[PDB]
Design a protein around this ligand. Structure first.
Ligand SMILES: [Cl-]
Length: 428
């Protein structure tokens, strides 16, 4: 009760939002208020921040606070294990990883808002969600101007090096062509994302607006799309399932009554948070982005198991004229999706993405209705309707992903510039 009010007043004066968020969090951990600590966490504020004596004065809880205490110390002193785990994961990542969406949480929240505003549900008979902007992420060419040691640090902090090594060194999943990766400057980079599930959604957003799926906006759209378009996707799925077993030469069958339950479940997948999503979900996402999604993944991983994720996901249920030709690329390893992005040409950047594997075999086109199956001649013809394709000098069939500096989204540009500032200001 005995507070020097003059002193207090002077202190409060010099305080900004992030100070209040810090001090609120300090009380938060005393009190067991997880929102108070999440709120500080998502501000991007240093979880290592230590209480100053002024802050201790302002707080006025002798039993609880002292100069030098951090949130982590408060969390041990009181019994908040929950919080400790969040705190320590945050600290670990902050030191190993620094991606564009973490550099300025207010701006990434503006980006989220812009994506939400851009997202609508089609009226009429096919009530699928859809975006209204075409946005594609490329690493900035300015990276090449960094000092070598700074480049490696930047790559350590934005790439998933483990995923890169399995897609590129351990087997020829990506960058297997000298021509594409080097002569034509189309080397692909696997962006890191946290594995706490939802890698699919985080990956699509990273390939696209450069952020993760904050506050689950993309996910809810995906969920509501599947639910409100159930019968549309159900039919494509049923054939996709039969497609497979068709390939082992095995003649099977299910009772309509039973396709039903198997459908109801994958329907729950999008609602149950952090569960695993499968190819039907990639298919729906291609509709929501109004563009193709190419997935590169192992040819057969476990070999205890064959894989069926690799291939091309076309937004087949829209009119072609409704859809952009430019695709995004995702990499698939062991139950995990990664955004695969190229570096900008060092005007227009053209990234050449192969529509064949390293053995030059056409990638699979998923969810094709039997009325669409056909020769390799015919498949390729389909791919040419939906993508902007050409054949390299070396003979590789590729889809082109074209982007322009001019057409880049301004908030994305600002975020990428601020992320680069962190490396540009490093001496040496
Ligand atoms: Cl149904």
């Amino acid at each position: 009760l005995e507070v020097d009010f003059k002193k207090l007043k002077q202190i409060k004066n010099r305080m900004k939002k992030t100070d209040w968020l810090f001090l609120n969090a300090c009380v938060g951990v005393v009190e067991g208020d997880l929102a108070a600590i999440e709120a500080y966490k998502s501000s991007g504020g240093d979880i290592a921040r230590q209480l100053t004596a002024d802050e201790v004065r302002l707080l006025n809880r002798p039993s609880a606070f002292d100069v030098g205490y951090t949130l982590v110390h408060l969390a041990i002193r009181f019994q908040r294990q929950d919080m400790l785990a969040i705190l320590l994961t945050e600290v670990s990542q902050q030191a190993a990883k620094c991606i564009p969406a973490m550099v300025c949480p207010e701006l990434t929240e503006q980006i989220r808002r812009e994506i939400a505003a851009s997202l609508h549900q089609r009226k009429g008979d096919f009530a699928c969600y859809f975006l209204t902007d075409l946005v594609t992420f490329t690493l900035p060419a300015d990276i090449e101007d960094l000092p070598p040691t700074v480049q490696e640090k930047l790559f350590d902090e934005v790439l998933d090096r483990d995923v890169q090594k399995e897609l590129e060194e351990e087997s020829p999943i990506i960058n297997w062509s000298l021509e594409l990766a080097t002569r034509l400057d189309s080397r692909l980079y696997a962006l890191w994302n946290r594995t706490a599930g939802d890698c699919l959604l985080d990956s699509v957003l990273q390939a696209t607006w450069g952020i993760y799926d904050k506050d689950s906006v993309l996910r809810k759209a995906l969920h509501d799309s599947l639910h409100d378009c159930s019968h549309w996707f159900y039919t494509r799925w049923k054939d996709w399932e039969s497609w497979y077993s068709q390939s082992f030469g095995l003649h099977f069958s299910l009772r309509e009554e039973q396709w039903q339950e198997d459908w109801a479940f994958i329907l729950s997948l999008a609602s149950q948070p952090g569960a695993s999503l499968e190819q039907t979900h990639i298919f729906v996402l291609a509709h929501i982005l109004r563009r193709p999604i190419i997935v590169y993944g192992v040819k057969y991983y476990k070999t205890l198991g064959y894989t069926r994720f690799q291939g091309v996901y076309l937004p087949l249920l829209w009119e072609q004229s409704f859809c952009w030709k430019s695709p995004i690329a995702l990499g698939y390893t062991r139950g995990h999706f990664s955004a695969l992005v190229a570096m900008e040409n060092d005007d227009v950047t053209i990234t050449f993405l192969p529509l064949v594997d390293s053995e030059r075999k056409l990638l699979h086109v998923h969810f094709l209705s039997a009325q669409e199956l056909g020769n390799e001649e015919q498949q390729e013809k389909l791919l040419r309707e939906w993508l902007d394709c050409c054949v390299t000098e070396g003979g590789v069939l590729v889809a082109m992903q074209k982007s322009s500096r001019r057409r880049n989204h301004p908030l994305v540009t600002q975020m990428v510039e601020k992320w680069l500032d962190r490396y540009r200001q490093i001496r040496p």
